[PDB]
Amino acid sequence: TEFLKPRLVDIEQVSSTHAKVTLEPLERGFGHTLGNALRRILLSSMPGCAVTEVEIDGVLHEYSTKEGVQEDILEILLNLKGLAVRVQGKDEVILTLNKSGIGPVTAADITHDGDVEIVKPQHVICHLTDENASISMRIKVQRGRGYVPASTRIHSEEDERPIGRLLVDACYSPVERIAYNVEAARVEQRTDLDKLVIEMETNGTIDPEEAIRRAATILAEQLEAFVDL
Amino acid sequence: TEFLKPRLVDIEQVSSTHAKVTLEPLERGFGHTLGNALRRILLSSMPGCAVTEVEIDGVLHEYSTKEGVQEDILEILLNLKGLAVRVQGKDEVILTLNKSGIGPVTAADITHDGDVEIVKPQHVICHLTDENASISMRIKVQRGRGYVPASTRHSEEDERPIGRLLVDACYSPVERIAYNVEAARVEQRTDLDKLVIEMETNGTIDPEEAIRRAATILAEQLEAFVDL
Amino acid sequence: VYSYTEKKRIRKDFGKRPQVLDVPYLLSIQLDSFQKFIEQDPEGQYGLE
Amino acid sequence: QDVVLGLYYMTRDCVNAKGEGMVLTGPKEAERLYRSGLASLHARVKVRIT
Amino acid sequence: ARVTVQDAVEKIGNRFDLVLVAARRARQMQVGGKDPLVPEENDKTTVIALREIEEGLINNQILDVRERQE
Amino acid sequence: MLNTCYRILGLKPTVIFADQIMYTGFAYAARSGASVGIDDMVIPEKKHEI
Amino acid sequence: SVITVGPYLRLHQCGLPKKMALELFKPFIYGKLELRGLATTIKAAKKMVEREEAVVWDILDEVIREHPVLLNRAPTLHRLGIQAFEPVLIEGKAIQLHPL
């Protein structure tokens, strides 16, 4: 018979970083089947944007000691890894930053462009302690999915690696914490109809609606080959 | 996007209705997801036809046995449990089974109609004595979804008049499903999940296509907001 | 009490017995001993003198 | 070490749990009752085996 | 493919001349070899001999008698 | 158990049966859940009096 | 090398790291490679397998299928210290072993 195909309602936002989404009532027993599959897809494959290569002018290798800054360069690489950026126009975009004078170097100092967007301008990277402590770096940002280490990113092995290059491990995971709950929805007179709610924690780069839409699309595409002989 | 489409399906099955299928190694973690979804749908989420109520001409209490049968009431209910019938058209049907004499009670003498379509009608139901064994009863077959336990049919409301014995039967044609996932390799990677499903049913429908039906069902659940 | 570096991150503890003697310098076994061997000790009975 | 405790938990019997006191056609049914979360892993059912 | 020799033990039980005759078979199946008597599924001669024990017409005592045939 | 099988059916059934035992035991130990905590180690109340 | 638990293997199977597998079976790889004619000389085969190309993995998985390896702890106290297994190629750097 019928199956009461569910749509999505109540896609509101609470803190601009994590969102609660609600689905139309599902059939009995379908809350756990869809919930687990959607959660696994979300934590498995999403399009994400992250930094891979950084090139500071005054440095030889990552274990150097840049003059002026009061912390090492390894923590610079870690902070760049923790940075969350959103590119819309293309996939591969190069960012540059230039800062001088005493004061912390927040992410807002980045040379923002029209095809990129910074979601956390208050994110700090380095603290400058000298009135003449000019710093300059070029940041390579690109798209991807899953986790890729720098060990397998050197697989290219074209020797196109000058000394000033620095490879930072990439984490294309726009979603951090996902969870869902099954609630007994109220309908006309049915009882098997129950609503499902998904609370998802994001760094702020992907909207929940398009995220769940792409997850459902990927699952349907995977099942398309399954429904055959 | 840029995903690994599963191919290289398998069809071999050493049985009449007990099929196993293997797929191309999927991406990490996708084998468990698809296996779990398919298993949870196949266990309790199809339309199906099964007996729901049986009334025995002579038996009043569910533990009140009768002479002329070497089995018991519980034994005969278990025997008729695996009836494995499919009915089309009306979702509710009633039928009568009458047999007098000696020997086993098969399913051919069920007085079949145009809406029974019984498969392998040699299922043993009862055994008879010399002449006193003239048994007769009525069986109600209903269309339902998945598995319904006896308790939920709420059962102890005394709404059944005398001997309208309820039967704990399943509408889902699938009898047992279990899936394994193991590592497989590609030209350079060697960790991709590859899935195998052990599928067998009661012969009502072909196991090769049965899972397909389930797939379609889940596809419907995604047709509301699938981007394409 | 509660020096400036201690105020940075105060560590909660469950201590019933009030310590009376502080922990000594964990290297006094070595230093002091060598301090006897090399010092310019007059009338030294234990030393290179 | 580990598998022995798993088998021990496989075969126990509490005095009351969800899905007890009824009957099953065979060992195949018991797998479907437990997997669908309708009966406990250990109960007091009466099953027919060959 | 084949991993156990229970079929060899239950009727032709001996672990020493059996492996000796299997080695004698496999050596000249490898160099100067001919077609085997059973279908091959990406195996080498290091396992094809044991499967020939299962068919019955090849066995440890058979090879010793078959040595006279050659 | 295994010993009995080794003396009734041979070798291959025994080894495949042992493999099935290992798989089922691992699966149903993972699915069961068996943790140890302070509330699980109960001190007999009489002990102090003793 | 060090060991670990592969609780998805059969009684006659043990895991092997890819690096150790190729290092151990490189003499067999050259014979397999030269038979198929992909390589020409021993130096050619060595430089071909040195780059770890696609065909090397599949030919190695072919030769691994029937070639038991012997595992033994350092203190071989009794008769079961040395056992045999059929290798199964996996990623990592540890000998995946059956639990039982």
Place this chain on the structure above:
Amino acid sequence: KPLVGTGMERAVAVDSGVTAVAKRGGVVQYVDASRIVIKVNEDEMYPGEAGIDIYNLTKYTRSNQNTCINQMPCVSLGEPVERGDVLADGPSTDLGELALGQNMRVAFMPWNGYNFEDSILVSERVVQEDRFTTIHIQELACVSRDTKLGPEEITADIPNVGEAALSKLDESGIVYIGAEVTGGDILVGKVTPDVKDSSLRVPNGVSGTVIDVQVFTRDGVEKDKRALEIEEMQLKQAKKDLSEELQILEAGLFSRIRAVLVAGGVEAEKLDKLPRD
């Protein structure tokens, strides 16, 4: 930090000499990733010497177990310090407290036998964020001896080599700093004279980036281009360190002489227009 400790962490961290501890109390005047300058308190510094404290923190250096040592300045600008206060944190410590590993979130439950007897499971999240990744420093030493068939030269010309191999090398025969070397590659090129290439090669398997290079030789001997350039770099570094030390001391001296010249008659125009000299 360890979530549950004992209270001896601070004692073990500060009694050992790995971490840098403030010798004299005062206030901080200039922080850097490699050195710390502390403006000593006026009432504490004895008369005659009116300088300020300099702490030259160490950096990545080879250790007896090949682990790395690097002090991190755990202080900021314009905050008071006390005598015996912690100013920098060495390896395996932070804020003057011992810290040996990491505080993971763990659950006690059998799981499909992957934690069968003593084995452990690790979520891929921790390896994403590099919470346990370590850094190791290895030393490779190549000596140049003299056999009967002439001394072995360290020249950059070697037979039976490819241009790709020498591309990472310079024209003197020693690799640069920061070039990501691979297994089996050549770091310094040496041939034994018919010349036998007794050069130094990276052991197979290990691969990284070269941090430092050091050259030692006897007096009265040839110095290659790289030898002279690294010697000049060391000379410039020593001169820079001495210049920074003397300029910091002179800033302190100017401060003290201005403080003692503010009284007894000071020229207003000379104070703000004429230079200090």
Place this chain on the structure above:
Amino acid sequence: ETVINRDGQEEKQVSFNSIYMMADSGARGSAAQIRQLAGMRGLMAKPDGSIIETPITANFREGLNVLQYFISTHGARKGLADTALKTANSGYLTRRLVDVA
């Protein structure tokens, strides 16, 4: 421990406590370990063979006095030293069995 009612009155049956599951199933541990965890650890003997007259009255879950722990130290050091030094004399014995047979 377990007392679960079945349609009215309460009934007793075998406990599902995890520690007792480990002990009874034989997976790991025995009666001695479970006794030490909750009950008395047991009176220990001095290494020369004399048994001390004051047994430990506290289990591992409860606190242990400094003397009780110190008394319990050399009880395990003797066993650890025996195990460490047993890897040579015993194995050597096998050699003297292999050559003769």
Place this chain on the structure above:
Amino acid sequence: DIVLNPLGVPSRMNIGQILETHLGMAAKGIGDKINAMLKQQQEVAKLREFIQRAYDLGADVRQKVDLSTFSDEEVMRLAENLRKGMPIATPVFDGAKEAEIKELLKLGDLPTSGQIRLYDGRTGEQFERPVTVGYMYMLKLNHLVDDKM
């Protein structure tokens, strides 16, 4: 993030690690609470009370800290430094009893038993038994796999 094996502790008798796990789970609860209202942009007055109860809890202790006398800036710095979890110091033979653990669990919103409901990652089902979860401080030893292979 780490899944251990319980079967180790009943035989090896190293039962103290269970108490360490319980404290570690307890310690994080205070950290998240601070992280809850620090991210909420709350006035320093609310913090001063809460951290006050987080330091004066338990039986008679040698610790006696007056939180309301440092500053506003220093209390903000402490909150920013304790958002990852309040450290706990336990003397070797003078440690905390179970009552202190229960009392500190009272301050948070965590179960007293230390065992919470879990969910299987693959099947999405619920384990029939509560499972202990907590924060354990573990070390990586020098026996690297690459050196041994």
